[PDB]
């Protein structure tokens, strides 16, 4: 009936908005890279471009939000949980918030600073759901909004099924099966539009298509390397709790310290400014970014960390791994650069999600999990250079496979969800990594749940949301 | 805490019970085939073996159930829905029911008669959940039973994630996310045990491992053949409604007709007897089974219908497709034999799920959907012998891929679920068939929901369950 039209419109509109956002963000990232390379010889000028491009974009995000809608900052999942639990917010689901969030998120995603997309997208989609509901009906509420959430993450990860399931877990305590089906229908239409848009504009934005891996794995799967996948999970759960803890601590700190809050209220663009500056100054490729693959932007990181190669073996021969040759440093061993990437991007992601801009957490923690997973996988490939024999099969170590698992585990420990495995399955391949991933993500969730709250639940607490 | 132990025990116990059941059922199917082949020259004796083996096993199933627990018949999902909605039944979750169901289902699955496994398994698992809860705690209830449901279908399809999601959709109207995580943990442990059991006993029972396909498909996917996948969905929705309708009509008919019910009450083994006899007499390979691949047993059918070949092209050259050469009849064209399989197995499945034995519906309708899908795919391969060019890629038709989609669509129209796509994704490959399957299953659900109730909802109505 009318609900069917609502779902179709939701999917279509979201796919279009998401595509547009991603397109402009990708074009901005290309200009970033091009401008940096245009100042090639001059090192001080390379620094200028490398730090000011993100600075301008993040400062713009903050300013735009502040001016248009100051409630279009900081994810959407925490506040959607509150709204779905009855407590409607202020001007959260308004049209100004839409404009603010969409433009400011595009700018944040085209800066290279590790900000998220999933959170803001859920809010963007819920605004669109509310708007579409008004446009259709007036020209329950929880049902409308919960489908919004589903298509938000569905169009964010470019993963229909996984997205719907993710939303259900992060935005609801008791879901209705009707809303599950409705969200799935709308998300499949979003994916349909995405496929048509792909045919139309080819290159444009590769909406999560770089994360499609090419792992030729044997179906039975080595249960001798399952302990490693489980260890990834356990450690990712611990690190997920550390992420949540440290993020909450910084989030509280900047306001709970009277002097800090006062100073930052007088100068609203000081906090985003300094954070962006230091992040970009540490990712400067001819500076510290050579030891942490700072040249790589969020998406490129995941695309290379999910490679079908073994960096530890092709270290003597770089320039053969493609875009994954930035991880091989002339001197520093790959393992140590993946470690430094993880460490550096841990604090970077924590402080970037604290900035007054639209920022979520999935992608930052996804690249962090991928880094941890890859580190483990590369060490496993160093410990087992000839592979591990199981029954009669010498299973070779695929470090990129470990990365996929690690990504799902850390991003499932931070968000307290087990649907990240499904998101990963659809973004990559499926079999021979189902059990490994399941074990890892479940173990991660367990450890993290026992230690700290979820990112969104912790943000609810920081903002003292009625919930 | 104690819940973690409950989940681990549930998964372990279910994996063991399911494996044992499947092992004995597979050994029975092997004896069936062996005995049939031992009477090779004598056609009347081949008939005897072909019809009496299933007869004995089904009559035994019925008798065992009747004697031990007469409430261990007819699926479990319909009655689990009722129990989960507060209305506890009689001696449904008792230990006699366990024995009855497990033994009788093993016999029904080793007969070759199209009976299901998913439904009874959900009941078997819920009994085990209740028993484990008593064993643990005494030595809420809905939470315990819900996890049982999840691990039941998880160990049935050998699909952890898909199973959990399936159960949520078929046994609940409003699910809690806690139960989702709990069910997932228990189902991943079930899968873990299954992997260990596989290593241990190798051949034994190939727990849904024959359905693992080898489709080398191109990622972008032909949107020019998407209309065909959508048509599969629409038609599968119509056929799913016909299945439900006809099954309900037969189910009501046998009791609503006074004379029939009276006669069948005096002779309880008459109905199962005659149904089994006629099904087996029509699947007799040197009789009518040559035109409907009756030699193939439920699992073998799915394994061959999910082949990476094109029967329409290798018809002049059979004995090269392997076990899929039974579909190529010397005279009758493959397409017509797949059609006859579908038609014959449609009524067969409808009347087999009406028998007084433990019987579900997933697998019967899964093979029916696979047949329909394959028929479409083979016709598509006949209409497009050189493939269909999209952008710059000549996508070749993979009839087996269409079968996977058809299976998910018809089994999602009968059960009114969209999680069958995920079950299929995990049973087979994933990418390049996500959107096709999603579209198909959603369209199937839509058409079917608009026409008839779900199988389980219709059974609830037949049995006048309070629900």
From Swiss-Prot, chains A, B:
Q: What does this protein do?
A: Voltage-gated chloride channel involved in skeletal muscle excitability. Generates most of the plasma membrane chloride conductance in skeletal muscle fibers, stabilizes the resting membrane potential and contributes to the repolarization phase during action potential firing. Forms a homodimeric channel where each subunit has its own ion conduction pathway. Conducts double-barreled currents controlled by two types of gates, two fast glutamate gates that control each subunit independently and a slow common gate that opens and shuts off both subunits simultaneously.
Q: What is the effect of changing residue 411 to I?
A: In MCAR; uncertain significance
Q: Where is this site: Protopore gate?
A: 118
Subcellular compartments: Cell membrane; Cell membrane, Sarcolemma; Cell membrane, Sarcolemma, T-tubule
Q: Where does chloride bind?
A: 75, 362, 456
Tell me what happens on changing residue 377 to R.
In MCAR; reduced chloride transport; changed calcium channel activity; changed channel gating
Instruction: Give the family, as the similarity comment puts it.
Output: Belongs to the chloride channel (TC 2.A.49) family. ClC-1/CLCN1 subfamily.
Q: Effect of altering residue 148 to V?
A: In MCAR; decreased chloride channel activity
Q: Where is this motif: Selectivity filter part_1?
A: 74-78
- Extracellular topological domain: 37-44, 200-225, 287-292, 305-335, 377-399, 433-435
Q: Where is this motif: Selectivity filter part_2?
A: 116-120
Span within the entire protein?
115 to 589 of 988
Mainly resides where? membrane
How is this protein annotated for GO cellular component? chloride channel complex; plasma membrane; T-tubule
Q: Give one GO term, molecular function aspect.
A: voltage-gated chloride channel activity
* Outcome when changing residue 185 to S: In MCAD; reduced chloride transport; changed chloride channel activity; changed gating of the channel; dominant negative effect
Q: What else is known?
A: Each monomer is composed of 18 alpha helices arranged in an internal pseudo-symmetry with an inverted membrane orientation. Most helices do not traverse the membrane completely.
| Recorded consequence of changing residue 191 to T | In MCAD and MCAR
Q: What is this protein called?
A: Chloride channel protein 1
